[PDB]
């Protein structure tokens, strides 16, 4: 699957290096990760929520 949402808004990382490949190690073959993963990585959440 080619990544299909090029918009990376309110994100902690751009979409470019987020659209890369991780290494092919003992648990995973070659595949593609997500655009907005770093925004989901350690974001301090909404205080009013």
How far do the termini sit from each other? Answer: 34 Å
**Radius of gyration, whole Å:** 13 Å
Structural class: little secondary structure
Query: What share of residues is helical?
Result: under 10%
Beta percentage is under 5%
The number of helical runs is 1
Oligomer: part of a larger assembly
PDB class: rna
Keywords: RNA exosome, Helicase, RNA
Entry title: Structure of the nuclear RNA exosome
Name: Exosome complex exonuclease RRP6
Note the topology.
Elements lengths: L14 H4 L31
Summarize the structure in words.
The PDB classes it as rna. Keywords: RNA exosome, Ribosome, pre-ribosome, Mtr4, Helicase, RNA. With 49 residues, this protein is largely without helices or strands. The chain has one helix and no strands. The chain has one helix spanning 15-18. The longest helix is centred in the middle third of the chain and has 4 residues, at 15-18.
């Amino acid at each position: 699957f080619i990544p299909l949402l090029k918009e990376k808004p309110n994100a902690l990382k751009p979409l470019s290096e987020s659209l890369r490949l991780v290494d092919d190690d003992e648990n995973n073959p070659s595949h593609y990760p997500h655009p907005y993963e770093y925004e989901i990585d350690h974001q301090e959440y909404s205080p009013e929520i």
